[PDB]
Design a protein around this ligand. Structure first.
Ligand SMILES: Nc1ncnc2c1ncn2[C@@H]1O[C@H](CSCC[C@H](N)C(=O)O)[C@@H](O)[C@H]1O
Ligand SMILES: Nc1ncnc2c1ncn2[C@@H]1O[C@H](CSCC[C@H](N)C(=O)O)[C@@H](O)[C@H]1O
Ligand SMILES: C/C=C/c1ccc(O)c(OC)c1
Lengths: 358, 351
C-alpha cells in the first residue's frame, strides 16, 4: 500500500469529487428527460452514430429554436458518462459541433427485438414519487419509521393503490426489468421443467408467469399479486391472475416463484411469507427465489454497486427491506421449514435459489 | 459484455441514491461525528456514530451502516472489515480524502452547504419540467415555480439562506486559493463584487488588502442576509439597471447564470462603471473541448446542465466564448490570470 502525500494536486481532486457528488443527481435526471423525449430511440432509428442535436430536434414535436442546443447540452453530459458516444465536426465556419451515437449501454435503454428495455425501469427509479422519501431519510433514522411512509402517510404498496399514475409506472418498470432478466434465467435454469402448476407470488402484471408458460406450454401458472396490480394484468393463455395479500396466504401450486419479493420485507415478514409458501406446496414442492445476494465487501465494482444501491433504496421505500447474503437466505429457508437450499443460477446479478422442502 | 451493459443501466437508473444518501449523512452530521471521533487507527463503528446522534431509535446503527456501505462503495468514506466470531463480517468506517471538503476545516468552512443546496427539494423539482422546456421553450425552473430562480429566492427564505450559504462556502474555499496566486487586486482602491452574494468574497479581498474599499452588490433579499464585515459596503440593486462605480469589478459565477444577451448587457454596464483603464475580473469555469470522463470536466458539464435547469439561460462557455463577450462589450484586452478548483480568473481589460 503506497501512501499518497496530500498536495495541491490531491486537494484539487478531492474538491472536485465533492463538487461532482453534490450535483450527481443531474445524470439520472438528464437521462430521464432524454428517455421521455424519446431521444435514444430517435438515435437508434435515425443514425446513419452519429447524428447532430439539430437532426434529433427535427424529429421532435417542437418549434422551440433552442431545442437543438438544449439537446446538445444534455447529450454532452450523457457522453461524459459513456451513456452516449460523440464525434466532433468542425463547422466550415470555425466552431466545433458534436454529433452523437449510442453507446453499448443503450442496448438496454432502447427497445430490443421483442419490444423491451430497461428505460421504463429508469423512469420508475427517477419518478417524482420516489425522490420525495429521500428528504425524510434523516427523520426516519432519528425518529424511526420508513421515509416513504413519512412522505405520504402510508406504505408504498398502499400508495400504488391510491396513485394510479405511479401504479402504472411501477408495474411497467418492474415488468420490463423482469422480462429482460427472466429471458436469460429461462435460458440457463432448468428448475421449471416438469412442473404442472406454478404460482408467481407478487408477480406484478404477470410478465414472468407469461414467459414461463410460453417456454413450457404444459405448465399452468397463477399470477398472484395485490388487487390494484391484478386489475391491470393483461390476459395471457395459461395464466390465471388472482388478487390477494400473500401474508394472508398464497395459492397452491407445485412450485412458488418469488422474484424481488424477499428484499422488500424484514426477516419476520419473510419468514411469514415463506411459511405461507411452505403450506401451499406439496411434500416435495420448492420455492424458487430470485434475488440479488449481498457481496462480501462494498467494493467499487458496478455489480456490487447495483446491489448496494438497491439495499439503500429498500431503506427509503420499503417496510424493512434489505439485501441479504447467501447465508442469510439459507437461514430464512431452514427457519421456515425447507430442508434443501441450492443456488441454482445467476443472470444479470439476479441469483436463482431453490428452497426445497426435502 | 451484455451483463456489464445491463448492470451499468441499472446503476444509472438508481444513481440519485448516492447524492441523496450523502445529503442525509451530512444533515445527520455523520461525517463531522466521524472526523471528531475516529480513534488514531482511524475507523469507527456505526453503533459508535449512532450513539452520538439525538436518537433513541434502536434501528439507527443498522440504517447508518447501510448508508455508509453505499458511501464506501463510492470511496466517499473508507472502510475496514472486522470478522465476527460467528463468521459474518462487520464494517467500520473512516474518512476518505473527499471528507476534507465535506467537513469544516480550520477556517470553519466546507463544501457541505453546497451539497445541501444542490440536493435541495426545491432544486429537484425543475428536472420534471425539462422535457416540457425542451419541446415548448422556456426554463424548467420557471415552469415549476411562478418565476425565475432569483425571484423565487426572494419568496422562499429557507432556500434563499441555503443557496447563499452554499455559494458562500464554495466561494470561500476557492477564493482562499485564488488569493494565494492572483495579484490582480493590488493598486486597486475600490472593488465592486457584482452578484457578490452575502459578501464572503468581498470580505476576503479586504482582509487581504485592507487598503481596498469593497462594495458587495447583490439583490435586496440577499443583501438582507449579508453580515457586516468592516471595509465591505453592502448594496442592494439590480445589476442589469446599473453597476456601482469602482476601480475594478469582480464577477464570480455570474456569467454562467445568464444568456449571451444578458451577459452583454451586464458587461456593458460594467464597462460604464469603470474608469478608463479599469478591468472586470471574471471567475468562471471554462468548458473543456470534449465530453471527457475526468472529474474536472464532469464538474463543468454538471454545472452546465444545472444552468439549463435553473437559470435564465445560463450555460458554461469556452475561453474563446468569453473573449467574444469581452470584445462585444467593448473590452480591448483579455487575460487568463490563474485557476483554483476549475475556477479560472480572467480579466477583461478596458485598454
Ligand atoms: N401483501 C402483498 N401480497 C401480494 N403481492 C404483494 C404484496 N405486497 C407487495 N406485493 C407485490 O410485490 C411486488 C414487488 S415488485 C416485484 C414484482 C415482480 N415479482 C418482479 O420481479 O418483477 C409488487 O408487484 C407488489 O404489488
Ligand atoms: N440582477 C441581479 N443583480 C445583482 N445580483 C443578481 C442579479 N440576479 C442574480 N443576482 C445574484 O447573482 C448571484 C449568483 S450566485 C454566485 C455568485 C457569488 N459571486 C459566488 O461566486 O459565490 C446571486 O447571489 C444572485 O442573488
Ligand atoms: C425505484 C426503486 C426500485 C424499487 C422500489 C421499491 C420496491 O418495492 C421495488 O421492488 C421490490 C423496487
Amino acid at each position: 500500500e503506497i501512501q499518497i502525500i496530500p498536495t495541491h494536486s490531491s486537494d484539487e481532486e478531492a474538491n472536485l469529487f465533492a463538487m461532482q457528488l453534490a450535483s450527481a443527481a443531474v445524470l439520472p435526471m438528464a437521462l430521464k428527460a432524454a428517455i421521455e423525449l424519446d431521444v435514444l430511440e430517435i438515435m437508434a432509428k435515425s443514425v446513419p452514430g452519429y447524428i447532430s442535436p439539430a437532426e434529433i430536434a427535427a424529429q421532435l414535436p417542437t418549434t422551440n429554436p433552442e431545442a437543438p442546443v438544449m439537446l446538445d447540452r444534455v447529450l454532452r453530459l450523457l457522453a461524459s458518462y459513456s451513456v452516449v458516444t460523440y464525434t466532433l465536426r468542425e463547422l466550415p465556419s470555425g466552431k466545433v459541433e458534436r454529433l452523437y451515437g449510442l453507446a453499448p449501454v443503450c442496448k438496454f435503454l432502447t427497445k430490443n427485438e421483442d419490444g423491451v428495455s430497461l428505460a421504463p425501469f429508469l423512469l420508475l427509479a427517477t419518478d417524482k414519487v420516489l425522490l420525495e422519501p429521500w428528504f425524510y431519510l434523516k427523520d426516519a433514522i432519528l425518529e424511526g419509521g420508513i421515509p416513504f411512509n413519512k412522505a405520504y402517510g402510508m406504505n408504498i404498496f398502499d400508495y400504488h393503490g391510491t396513485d394510479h399514475r405511479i401504479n402504472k409506472v411501477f408495474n411497467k418498470g418492474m415488468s420490463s426489468n423482469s422480462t429482460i432478466t427472466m429471458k436469460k434465467i429461462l435460458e440457463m435454469y432448468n428448475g421449471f421443467e416438469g412442473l404442472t402448476t406454478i404460482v408467481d407470488v407478487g408477480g406484478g402484471t404477470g410478465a414472468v408467469a407469461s414467459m414461463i408458460v410460453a417456454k413450457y406450454p404444459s405448465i399452468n401458472a397463477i399470477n398472484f399479486d395485490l388487487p390494484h396490480v391484478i386489475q391491470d394484468a393483461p390476459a395471457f393463455s395459461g395464466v390465471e391472475h388472482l388478487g390477494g395479500d400473500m401474508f394472508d396466504g398464497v395459492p397452491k401450486g407445485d412450485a412458488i416463484f418469488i422474484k424481488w419479493i424477499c428484499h422488500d420485507w424484514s426477516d419476520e415478514h419473510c419468514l411469514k411469507l415463506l411459511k405461507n409458501c411452505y403450506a401451499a406446496l406439496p411434500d416435495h414442492g420448492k420455492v424458487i427465489v430470485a434475488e440479488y445476494i449481498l457481496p462480501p465487501s462494498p467494493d467499487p465494482s458496478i455489480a456490487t454497486k447495483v446491489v448496494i444501491h438497491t439495499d439503500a433504496l429498500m431503506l427509503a421505500y420499503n417496510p424493512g427491506g434489505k439485501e441479504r447474503t447467501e447465508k442469510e437466505f439459507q437461514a430464512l429457508a431452514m427457519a421456515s421449514g425447507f430442508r434443501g437450499f441450492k443456488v441454482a443460477s445467476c443472470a444479470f446479478n439476479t441469483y436463482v435459489m431453490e428452497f426445497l422442502k426435502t
